[PDB]
């Protein structure tokens, strides 16, 4: 008998996909204990997700405190040479 939280069932759950994707987009690093709830780490099996901050758009978008040139909001992975 399988509940939605049961270990053999997690890959069938739409929310397990959605929250793992959403976790990768929120993180700045692989340090899960710092960034997430113990509940999220267990429920979405975040040890197994390749969380490292590389999939977060704010890693690449410039957001300098003083901007005289409208440079903020440019994403480096969208330039000519990326």
């Amino acid at each position: 008998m399988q509940l939605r939280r049961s270990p053999g069932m997690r890959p069938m759950d739409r929310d397990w996909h959605q929250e793992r994707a959403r976790a990768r987009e929120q993180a700045y690093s692989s340090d899960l204990t710092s960034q997430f709830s113990e509940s999220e780490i267990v429920k979405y099996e975040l040890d197994t997700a390749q969380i490292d901050g590389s999939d977060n758009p704010r890693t690449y978008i410039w957001n300098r405190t003083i901007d005289l040139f409208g440079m903020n909001g440019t994403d480096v992975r969208e330039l000519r040479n990326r």
Partner: peptide, 11 residues
């Protein structure tokens, strides 16, 4: 046997 919560939320 599976819960309806799982059945409804499946891929």
């Amino acid at each position: 046997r599976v819960t309806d919560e799982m059945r409804d939320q499946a891929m």
